[PDB]
Amino acid sequence: SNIQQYKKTLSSITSDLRENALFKAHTLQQTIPLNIDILALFSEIFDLDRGVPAEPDLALSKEMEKIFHSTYKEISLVKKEADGNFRVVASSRIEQLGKNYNQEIFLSDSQPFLATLRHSGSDSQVLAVLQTNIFDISSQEVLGVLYTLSDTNYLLNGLLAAKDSVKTAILSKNGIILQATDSSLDLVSIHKTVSKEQFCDVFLRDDICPPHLLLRPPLNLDPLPYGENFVSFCIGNTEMWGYIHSLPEMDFRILTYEEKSIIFASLWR
């Protein structure tokens, strides 16, 4: 039938957007959520059997700095106080020592760990934010959280490169682009509107939303008729088609996209 043929053709010329999103997603699944290995390394160096320090420990922080300053933006032991508040009691970032971290901690007591991406708030730096519960060896109560920040440029620079090639955008859960091949899309909304509440899961704290970001024209991604998760949008004067793939176990999404004219050139080339 003609409907079938039309659908087959549209599926064929968009297949590569989906394949690219899935490959990039798989790469990030293999490289970001390394919580177990980080906790195991940390524990092999510093003994957690007796718990986390009850008060900020400068000596321990200095040892963490010497080891990890070159490989992490931050590694911190965050005590869960009796009143449920979180406080940094040791960090490779000495300047973070003693800070209340209630806004920074998003890991509940029922999960072993989480791994997600957040924008640092400055430059174009996107961070892998890993939080791992420190469970009492006897009671299994949460004693604290091992909190790490890692610059993801060593992953995203390559995954967002498009020299030879589909383009890529990393999307927060509520629809803000964290970083894209086209830097003009960084910290722009994919929806028809942009609002402050979208930014609560974009940065390292749930209370950061600079006003200038609420003036950036959103992309207004428009679902395409057939298949699932394909979209159209414009960049400047150029029509794009894209595919959105969700990574629910890390609370971000991947948008691959390409000029519509290049997609359609596959009809003959």
Resolution rounded to one decimal, in angstroms:
1.7
Cα separation of 99 and 68, whole Å?
19
Query: What is the count of structural domains for the chain?
Result: 2
Q: How far is CA 174 from the centre of its chain?
A: 12
> What 8-state DSSP symbol labels residue 100?
B
Show the 3-state SS of 177-232. EEEECCHHHCCCECCCCCCHHHHHHCCCCCCCCCHHHHHCCCCCCEECCCCCCEEE
Contact 71, 93 (CB under 8 A): no
What kind of experiment solved this structure?
A: X-ray
Token pair of 13 as six digits: 């010329």
- At 229, list the tokens: 């998760």
Verify that 70 and 108 share a domain, yes or no: yes
Within 10 Å of residue 113's Cβ, how many Cβ atoms?
Answer: 17
| 176, β-bridge pairs | 189
Domain that holds residue 262: 1-33+152-269
Same domain (yes/no): 97, 128: yes
User: Do residue 71 and residue 164 come from a single domain?
Assistant: no
Q: Do 261 and 181 share a domain, yes or no?
A: yes
Residues 123 and 46 placed together within one structural domain of the fold: yes
Final residue in a domain of this structure, among 101, 126, 151: 151
Picking from 88, 117, 151, the residue at the C-terminal end of a domain is 151
> Using an 8 Å Cβ cutoff, are 113 and 134 in contact?
no
Nearest residue to 251 via CA among 178, 194, 182? 178
In a shared domain, residues 265 and 166: yes
Residues in the chain: 269
Give me the torsion for CA of 54, 58, 62, 68, rounded to 10°. Answer: 40
- Structure tokens belonging to residue 106: 């998003």
Q: Looking at 151, 174, 196, which one is the last position of a domain?
A: 151
Do 159 and 26 have their domain in common?
yes
Question: Are both 143 and 67 inside the same structural domain?
Answer: yes
What is the C-alpha to C-alpha distance for residues 153 and 35, in angstroms, rounded to an integer?
19
Question: What type of residue sits at position 248?
Answer: P
Instruction: State how far the Cα of 112 lies from the Cα of 135, in Å rounded to an integer.
Output: 9
Please tell me whether residues 184 and 104 are part of one structural domain. Answer: no
Let me know whether 136 and 157 are in one domain.
no
Return the structure tokens found at 158.
Answer: 């390559």
Considering the domain architecture, whether residues 183 and 251 belong to the same structural domain is answered as yes
29 and 156 together in one domain: yes
